[PDB]
Structure formats: structure tokens, C-alpha cells
Amino acid sequence: QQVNDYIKAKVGAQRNGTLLRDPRTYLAGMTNVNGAPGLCHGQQATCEI
Amino acid sequence: NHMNVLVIVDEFYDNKYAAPVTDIALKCGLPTEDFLHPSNYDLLRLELH
Amino acid sequence: MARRLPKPTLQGRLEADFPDSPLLPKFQELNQNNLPNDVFREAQRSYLVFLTSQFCYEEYVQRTFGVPRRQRAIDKR
Amino acid sequence: MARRLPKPTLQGRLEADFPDSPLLPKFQELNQNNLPNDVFREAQRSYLVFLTSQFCYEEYVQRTFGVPRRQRAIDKR
């Protein structure tokens, strides 16, 4: 868990923001969006690798 | 209270388990393009001037 | 609590080795009476270093001035 | 599964080729009772080896500590 938390923190800073899913208090309830206060280009295209 | 540096160095390096790092030592670690990325916000919060 | 470095390797009781060395008359003046014996040997090693250093400084001061006028004026005449 | 290396080419009966050496007293304690002559000769060669090495290291120990620093100051005038 220590190395997992370190990774999750470093990789794109998944924790505390800048992530697509919302792990907080889901309790298997729903799926929601995160972030995006204001966008000035358009619908964000998902780039896969 | 005492003058002699012998006991100062000894009692500091005698049993040193954890070695923490100052922050300005951390900032100089990162290059600019990595520094500005918003996975390093803990430093950006303290570069106001 | 100030803790000094270890003392270096030194050949113990050099005073027993060299007799009639001209410092020994003065060296004999020191007195162990009160102290334990290893403290006595340590302090007397220090005192011997001190006495030899005094003698060496005085010998160098005597060695300082050179090429005396009177001695050369008499020897070559 | 020994299957060792062949022994190095060496001269036979070194013990007798030289008349005497103080290793020989300890050396004569070995005796051949059960084994044939050749195997005993090999073991005896190895034991003479051990004795020579013993004396070599015992000599090096003396040489490390063989400077009567006291005989320098005493024996010199």
C-alpha cells in the first residue's frame, strides 16, 4: 500500500484531483464527473496509448 | 551550552533513523517542465514571490 | 559531556630509556603524589612534550642569528 | 567425487635430500601403519608443506615485532 499510494500520488496526481472518476463516497452508488471548472477548447478528446 | 563540536557531531549522527529534506532542496531537484506540472503543487503553493 | 579523542600509539615510559638528558633535572621536579598512576604517566608525557618544546624553541632562537662579524674576523685573520 | 587435478611435478624424497632442519622433530611424529607407501609419501609431503608454512608465518610474526627500539637508544652511545 505504501508504494501504491506513492504511485497514485505521482502518476498524474490521481489523488486530490486531476482524475476522471470520483472515488469519494461512492458506496457503489453512482458514477460522476470530476474537475473541469471551465474549459476553453471543447469536449476533451480521450487519448489512449 | 558547550563549545566542543565533538559531542555535537556525535550526538547528531549517533542514532539518526529518519532523514528529512528541506523544501528548497526539493525544488532544485525538479526541472522546469516537471516543476510546473500540477502533480507538484506542494512546491508551487510556496513560490509566490 | 565533552569526550576527547583517543590518545595515539606511543612508546610508554620513554623517561626510563634516556638518562642524563639535560631536561631530566627539571623533569624530576614534577610530583605524582596525589594522582593515580596512569593519569600521572599521561600528564608527565604532556610535561615532557612541553619541556622538549621549550628547549627546541630556545635552541632555534640561538640558531637564528648567523654569519657573525667577530667570529669570522678572528678565524680568517 | 574427488576426481582431482593431477599433482604438480615435484622432486621425490626432499626430506632426505637435505640433511637436517628443526622441522624434522615434529615431522617424525608421523608414521605409516595401514596405508601403502605411495599414499603415505603424498601425505608426508603435505605435512612437510604445513610445517614449512608454519615456520614461515611464525617468522613473519617475529619480523613484524623485532625492533628492540630500546636497543637503539641503549646500544648507541
mmCIF file of C-alpha atoms in Angstrom:
data_model
loop_
_atom_site.group_PDB
_atom_site.id
_atom_site.type_symbol
_atom_site.label_atom_id
_atom_site.label_comp_id
_atom_site.label_asym_id
_atom_site.label_seq_id
_atom_site.Cartn_x
_atom_site.Cartn_y
_atom_site.Cartn_z
ATOM 1 C CA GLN A 1 0.000 0.000 0.000
ATOM 2 C CA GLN A 2 2.853 2.434 0.619
ATOM 3 C CA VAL A 3 4.269 2.170 -2.887
ATOM 4 C CA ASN A 4 0.727 2.133 -4.276
ATOM 5 C CA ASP A 5 -0.121 5.400 -2.534
ATOM 6 C CA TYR A 6 3.148 6.933 -3.707
ATOM 7 C CA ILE A 7 2.414 5.926 -7.289
ATOM 8 C CA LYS A 8 -1.189 7.128 -7.191
ATOM 9 C CA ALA A 9 0.139 10.451 -5.907
ATOM 10 C CA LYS A 10 2.864 10.864 -8.526
ATOM 11 C CA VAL A 11 1.154 9.493 -11.639
ATOM 12 C CA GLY A 12 -0.829 12.456 -12.951
ATOM 13 C CA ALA A 13 -1.648 13.210 -9.304
ATOM 14 C CA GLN A 14 -4.668 10.912 -9.301
ATOM 15 C CA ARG A 15 -5.385 11.757 -5.648
ATOM 16 C CA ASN A 16 -6.739 15.163 -4.536
ATOM 17 C CA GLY A 17 -7.865 15.989 -8.084
ATOM 18 C CA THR A 18 -6.948 15.738 -11.779
ATOM 19 C CA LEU A 19 -8.694 12.402 -12.312
ATOM 20 C CA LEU A 20 -11.681 11.170 -14.314
ATOM 21 C CA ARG A 21 -13.550 9.061 -11.729
ATOM 22 C CA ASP A 22 -14.722 10.225 -8.291
ATOM 23 C CA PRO A 23 -13.707 7.552 -5.726
ATOM 24 C CA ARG A 24 -15.131 9.603 -2.862
ATOM 25 C CA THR A 25 -18.208 8.257 -1.013
ATOM 26 C CA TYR A 26 -19.487 6.281 -3.968
ATOM 27 C CA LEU A 27 -20.551 3.335 -1.784
ATOM 28 C CA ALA A 28 -21.272 1.571 -5.081
ATOM 29 C CA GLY A 29 -23.940 4.181 -5.683
ATOM 30 C CA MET A 30 -23.223 6.174 -8.834
ATOM 31 C CA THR A 31 -20.575 7.351 -11.297
ATOM 32 C CA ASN A 32 -19.800 11.048 -11.646
ATOM 33 C CA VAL A 33 -17.530 13.559 -13.358
ATOM 34 C CA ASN A 34 -14.656 15.374 -11.675
ATOM 35 C CA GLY A 35 -12.844 18.628 -12.258
ATOM 36 C CA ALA A 36 -13.324 20.849 -15.288
ATOM 37 C CA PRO A 37 -14.193 24.216 -13.730
ATOM 38 C CA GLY A 38 -14.082 25.956 -17.099
ATOM 39 C CA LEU A 39 -12.860 24.636 -20.450
ATOM 40 C CA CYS A 40 -11.900 26.961 -23.300
ATOM 41 C CA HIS A 41 -11.235 24.496 -26.137
ATOM 42 C CA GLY A 42 -14.038 21.945 -26.358
ATOM 43 C CA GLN A 43 -15.157 18.452 -25.460
ATOM 44 C CA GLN A 44 -11.977 16.810 -24.191
ATOM 45 C CA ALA A 45 -10.854 14.029 -26.517
ATOM 46 C CA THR A 46 -9.723 10.848 -24.771
ATOM 47 C CA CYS A 47 -6.212 9.952 -25.924
ATOM 48 C CA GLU A 48 -5.356 6.280 -25.472
ATOM 49 C CA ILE A 49 -1.943 4.657 -25.747
ATOM 50 C CA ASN B 1 25.891 25.386 26.010
ATOM 51 C CA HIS B 2 29.285 23.729 25.451
ATOM 52 C CA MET B 3 31.971 24.722 22.948
ATOM 53 C CA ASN B 4 33.289 21.391 21.711
ATOM 54 C CA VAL B 5 31.947 20.273 18.336
ATOM 55 C CA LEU B 6 32.832 16.635 19.024
ATOM 56 C CA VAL B 7 29.723 15.893 21.036
ATOM 57 C CA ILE B 8 27.589 17.991 18.681
ATOM 58 C CA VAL B 9 28.508 15.941 15.622
ATOM 59 C CA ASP B 10 28.458 12.687 17.600
ATOM 60 C CA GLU B 11 25.089 13.238 19.276
ATOM 61 C CA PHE B 12 23.606 14.301 15.942
ATOM 62 C CA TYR B 13 24.934 11.387 13.869
ATOM 63 C CA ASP B 14 24.821 8.846 16.702
ATOM 64 C CA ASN B 15 21.389 7.318 16.054
ATOM 65 C CA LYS B 16 19.858 9.025 13.024
ATOM 66 C CA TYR B 17 16.958 6.950 11.720
ATOM 67 C CA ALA B 18 14.855 9.384 9.674
ATOM 68 C CA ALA B 19 16.475 11.964 7.388
ATOM 69 C CA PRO B 20 14.030 14.695 6.322
ATOM 70 C CA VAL B 21 14.753 17.112 3.492
ATOM 71 C CA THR B 22 14.247 20.869 3.318
ATOM 72 C CA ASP B 23 11.879 22.220 0.690
ATOM 73 C CA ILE B 24 14.286 24.404 -1.278
ATOM 74 C CA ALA B 25 16.373 21.261 -1.563
ATOM 75 C CA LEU B 26 13.340 19.660 -3.207
ATOM 76 C CA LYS B 27 12.632 22.485 -5.654
ATOM 77 C CA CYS B 28 16.140 22.356 -7.104
ATOM 78 C CA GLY B 29 15.549 18.658 -7.735
ATOM 79 C CA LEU B 30 12.885 19.159 -10.384
ATOM 80 C CA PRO B 31 13.361 20.622 -13.871
ATOM 81 C CA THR B 32 11.077 23.400 -15.041
ATOM 82 C CA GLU B 33 8.705 21.408 -17.230
ATOM 83 C CA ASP B 34 8.273 18.878 -14.433
ATOM 84 C CA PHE B 35 8.120 21.629 -11.821
ATOM 85 C CA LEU B 36 5.116 23.362 -13.366
ATOM 86 C CA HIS B 37 3.106 20.165 -13.840
ATOM 87 C CA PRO B 38 0.138 20.012 -11.449
ATOM 88 C CA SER B 39 1.349 16.869 -9.768
ATOM 89 C CA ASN B 40 3.819 19.131 -7.954
ATOM 90 C CA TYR B 41 1.555 21.667 -6.314
ATOM 91 C CA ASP B 42 3.037 21.460 -2.828
ATOM 92 C CA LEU B 43 6.029 23.452 -4.052
ATOM 93 C CA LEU B 44 4.015 25.800 -6.268
ATOM 94 C CA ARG B 45 1.994 26.844 -3.233
ATOM 95 C CA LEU B 46 5.213 28.370 -1.865
ATOM 96 C CA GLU B 47 6.760 30.193 -4.823
ATOM 97 C CA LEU B 48 4.662 33.322 -4.654
ATOM 98 C CA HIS B 49 7.437 35.912 -4.844
ATOM 99 C CA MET C 1 29.802 15.835 28.331
ATOM 100 C CA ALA C 2 32.979 16.604 26.378
ATOM 101 C CA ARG C 3 34.542 13.319 25.251
ATOM 102 C CA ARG C 4 38.018 13.653 23.792
ATOM 103 C CA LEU C 5 39.542 11.599 21.012
ATOM 104 C CA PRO C 6 41.659 8.522 21.801
ATOM 105 C CA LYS C 7 45.322 9.034 22.504
ATOM 106 C CA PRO C 8 47.696 7.950 19.724
ATOM 107 C CA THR C 9 50.034 4.992 19.888
ATOM 108 C CA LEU C 10 53.160 5.993 21.804
ATOM 109 C CA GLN C 11 56.021 4.018 23.301
ATOM 110 C CA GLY C 12 55.389 4.041 27.034
ATOM 111 C CA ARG C 13 57.875 5.240 29.658
ATOM 112 C CA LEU C 14 60.465 6.909 27.453
ATOM 113 C CA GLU C 15 61.943 8.525 30.570
ATOM 114 C CA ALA C 16 63.324 5.137 31.582
ATOM 115 C CA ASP C 17 65.077 4.893 28.212
ATOM 116 C CA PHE C 18 67.080 8.129 28.075
ATOM 117 C CA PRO C 19 69.056 9.098 31.195
ATOM 118 C CA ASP C 20 71.301 12.116 31.765
ATOM 119 C CA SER C 21 69.381 14.057 29.144
ATOM 120 C CA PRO C 22 69.716 17.661 30.331
ATOM 121 C CA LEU C 23 65.960 18.167 30.762
ATOM 122 C CA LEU C 24 65.721 15.433 33.427
ATOM 123 C CA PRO C 25 66.918 17.738 36.268
ATOM 124 C CA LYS C 26 63.856 19.918 35.700
ATOM 125 C CA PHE C 27 61.643 16.935 34.871
ATOM 126 C CA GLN C 28 62.316 15.438 38.304
ATOM 127 C CA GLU C 29 60.623 18.444 39.913
ATOM 128 C CA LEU C 30 57.119 17.268 38.994
ATOM 129 C CA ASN C 31 55.322 15.304 41.702
ATOM 130 C CA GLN C 32 52.861 12.446 41.230
ATOM 131 C CA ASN C 33 51.999 12.255 44.900
ATOM 132 C CA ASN C 34 48.219 12.682 44.721
ATOM 133 C CA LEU C 35 47.151 11.325 41.350
ATOM 134 C CA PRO C 36 46.620 7.737 40.187
ATOM 135 C CA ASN C 37 49.373 6.267 38.077
ATOM 136 C CA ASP C 38 48.019 6.302 34.521
ATOM 137 C CA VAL C 39 46.934 9.920 34.929
ATOM 138 C CA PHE C 40 50.463 10.509 36.209
ATOM 139 C CA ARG C 41 52.041 8.910 33.138
ATOM 140 C CA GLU C 42 49.728 10.836 30.807
ATOM 141 C CA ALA C 43 50.380 14.203 32.447
ATOM 142 C CA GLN C 44 54.126 13.524 32.614
ATOM 143 C CA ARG C 45 54.142 12.664 28.914
ATOM 144 C CA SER C 46 52.488 16.037 28.348
ATOM 145 C CA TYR C 47 55.008 17.787 30.587
ATOM 146 C CA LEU C 48 57.895 16.114 28.762
ATOM 147 C CA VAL C 49 56.498 17.278 25.425
ATOM 148 C CA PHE C 50 56.288 20.767 26.913
ATOM 149 C CA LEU C 51 59.861 20.772 28.227
ATOM 150 C CA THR C 52 61.300 19.477 24.957
ATOM 151 C CA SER C 53 59.327 22.116 23.064
ATOM 152 C CA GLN C 54 60.753 24.864 25.276
ATOM 153 C CA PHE C 55 64.266 23.553 24.721
ATOM 154 C CA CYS C 56 63.734 23.317 20.962
ATOM 155 C CA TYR C 57 62.410 26.876 20.752
ATOM 156 C CA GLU C 58 65.374 28.190 22.742
ATOM 157 C CA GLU C 59 67.815 26.209 20.587
ATOM 158 C CA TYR C 60 66.217 27.620 17.441
ATOM 159 C CA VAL C 61 66.437 31.153 18.833
ATOM 160 C CA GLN C 62 70.124 30.518 19.445
ATOM 161 C CA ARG C 63 70.264 29.176 15.882
ATOM 162 C CA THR C 64 68.557 32.256 14.422
ATOM 163 C CA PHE C 65 71.300 34.849 14.036
ATOM 164 C CA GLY C 66 74.089 33.890 11.675
ATOM 165 C CA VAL C 67 77.326 34.907 9.943
ATOM 166 C CA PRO C 68 78.818 36.688 12.981
ATOM 167 C CA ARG C 69 81.264 39.500 12.323
ATOM 168 C CA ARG C 70 83.658 38.899 15.212
ATOM 169 C CA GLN C 71 83.988 35.133 14.805
ATOM 170 C CA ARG C 72 84.769 35.320 11.080
ATOM 171 C CA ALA C 73 87.028 38.339 11.622
ATOM 172 C CA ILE C 74 89.109 36.355 14.108
ATOM 173 C CA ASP C 75 89.048 32.941 12.393
ATOM 174 C CA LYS C 76 90.291 34.065 8.977
ATOM 175 C CA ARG C 77 92.834 36.542 10.355
ATOM 176 C CA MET D 1 33.503 -37.242 -6.458
ATOM 177 C CA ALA D 2 37.051 -36.002 -5.930
ATOM 178 C CA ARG D 3 38.398 -36.616 -9.456
ATOM 179 C CA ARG D 4 41.026 -34.023 -8.624
ATOM 180 C CA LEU D 5 43.650 -32.299 -10.718
ATOM 181 C CA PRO D 6 46.862 -34.251 -11.347
ATOM 182 C CA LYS D 7 49.550 -33.392 -8.825
ATOM 183 C CA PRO D 8 52.289 -30.902 -9.746
ATOM 184 C CA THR D 9 55.618 -32.265 -10.915
ATOM 185 C CA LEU D 10 57.837 -32.366 -7.829
ATOM 186 C CA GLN D 11 61.047 -33.985 -6.631
ATOM 187 C CA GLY D 12 60.850 -37.147 -4.568
ATOM 188 C CA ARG D 13 62.324 -37.627 -1.095
ATOM 189 C CA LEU D 14 63.015 -33.992 -0.286
ATOM 190 C CA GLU D 15 63.208 -34.874 3.409
ATOM 191 C CA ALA D 16 66.378 -36.933 2.934
ATOM 192 C CA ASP D 17 67.889 -34.869 0.114
ATOM 193 C CA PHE D 18 68.538 -32.244 2.764
ATOM 194 C CA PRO D 19 70.382 -33.445 5.895
ATOM 195 C CA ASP D 20 68.555 -31.673 8.718
ATOM 196 C CA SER D 21 66.155 -28.916 9.746
ATOM 197 C CA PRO D 22 64.384 -28.179 13.048
ATOM 198 C CA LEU D 23 61.051 -29.007 11.409
ATOM 199 C CA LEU D 24 62.146 -32.651 11.367
ATOM 200 C CA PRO D 25 61.476 -33.328 15.104
ATOM 201 C CA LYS D 26 57.771 -32.500 14.808
ATOM 202 C CA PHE D 27 57.927 -34.092 11.351
ATOM 203 C CA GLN D 28 58.938 -37.551 12.568
ATOM 204 C CA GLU D 29 55.768 -37.900 14.671
ATOM 205 C CA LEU D 30 54.002 -39.162 11.560
ATOM 206 C CA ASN D 31 54.303 -42.891 10.940
ATOM 207 C CA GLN D 32 52.975 -45.242 8.275
ATOM 208 C CA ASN D 33 50.834 -48.038 9.696
ATOM 209 C CA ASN D 34 47.938 -49.034 7.448
ATOM 210 C CA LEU D 35 48.313 -47.197 4.141
ATOM 211 C CA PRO D 36 50.687 -48.159 1.307
ATOM 212 C CA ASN D 37 53.997 -46.431 0.716
ATOM 213 C CA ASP D 38 52.898 -44.021 -2.039
ATOM 214 C CA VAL D 39 49.847 -42.572 -0.296
ATOM 215 C CA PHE D 40 51.896 -42.114 2.860
ATOM 216 C CA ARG D 41 54.581 -40.312 0.862
ATOM 217 C CA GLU D 42 51.951 -37.936 -0.509
ATOM 218 C CA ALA D 43 50.535 -37.229 2.951
ATOM 219 C CA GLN D 44 54.044 -36.736 4.336
ATOM 220 C CA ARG D 45 54.802 -34.282 1.537
ATOM 221 C CA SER D 46 51.713 -32.303 2.505
ATOM 222 C CA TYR D 47 52.708 -32.358 6.180
ATOM 223 C CA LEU D 48 56.200 -31.081 5.425
ATOM 224 C CA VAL D 49 54.402 -28.382 3.435
ATOM 225 C CA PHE D 50 52.376 -27.500 6.514
ATOM 226 C CA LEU D 51 55.472 -27.352 8.705
ATOM 227 C CA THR D 52 57.300 -25.084 6.268
ATOM 228 C CA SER D 53 54.327 -22.716 6.118
ATOM 229 C CA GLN D 54 54.060 -22.769 9.914
ATOM 230 C CA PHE D 55 57.650 -21.637 10.241
ATOM 231 C CA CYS D 56 57.232 -19.029 7.500
ATOM 232 C CA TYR D 57 54.324 -17.319 9.255
ATOM 233 C CA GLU D 58 55.958 -17.670 12.668
ATOM 234 C CA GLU D 59 58.944 -15.855 11.152
ATOM 235 C CA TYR D 60 56.797 -13.104 9.670
ATOM 236 C CA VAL D 61 55.315 -12.511 13.127
ATOM 237 C CA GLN D 62 58.809 -12.026 14.558
ATOM 238 C CA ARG D 63 59.711 -9.664 11.732
ATOM 239 C CA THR D 64 56.647 -7.504 12.374
ATOM 240 C CA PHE D 65 57.725 -7.097 16.002
ATOM 241 C CA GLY D 66 61.511 -7.399 16.018
ATOM 242 C CA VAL D 67 62.755 -3.847 16.526
ATOM 243 C CA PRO D 68 64.072 -3.515 20.111
ATOM 244 C CA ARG D 69 63.521 0.248 19.895
ATOM 245 C CA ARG D 70 65.198 0.094 23.310
ATOM 246 C CA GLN D 71 68.400 -1.405 21.920
ATOM 247 C CA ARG D 72 68.698 1.584 19.574
ATOM 248 C CA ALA D 73 68.950 4.111 22.392
ATOM 249 C CA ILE D 74 70.837 1.761 24.716
ATOM 250 C CA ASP D 75 73.335 0.225 22.291
ATOM 251 C CA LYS D 76 74.094 3.558 20.657
ATOM 252 C CA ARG D 77 76.403 5.609 22.866
#
